[PDB]
Amino acid sequence: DPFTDDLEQYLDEKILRLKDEMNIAAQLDIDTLNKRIETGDTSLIAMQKVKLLPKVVSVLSKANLADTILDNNLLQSVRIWLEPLPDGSLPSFEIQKSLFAALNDLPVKTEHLKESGLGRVVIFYTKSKRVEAQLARLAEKLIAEWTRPIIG
* φ and ψ of 43, to 5 deg: -80, 0
Please give the resolution of this entry in Å, rounded to 1 decimal. Answer: 2.2
> What's the domain range around 100?
40-152
Q: Are 125 and 91 in contact (CB under 8 A)?
A: no
Task: Give how many domains the chain has, as a whole number.
Answer: 2
Residue 80 makes CB contacts below 8 A (sequence gap 6+) with: 22, 23, 26
Same domain, 28 and 50: no
CA–CA distances in Å: residue 108 to residues 83, 94, 115, 139:
19, 21, 11, 14
| Same-domain check for residues 74 and 119 | yes
Distance, CA of 118 to chain centre: 8
Collect all residues with Cβ–Cβ distance below 8 Å to 46 and sequence separation of at least 6. 28, 29, 30, 32, 33, 36, 85
Calpha distance 68→5 (Å, rounded): 13
Residues 100 and 25 in one domain: no
CA–CA dist 3, 108 (Å, integer): 28
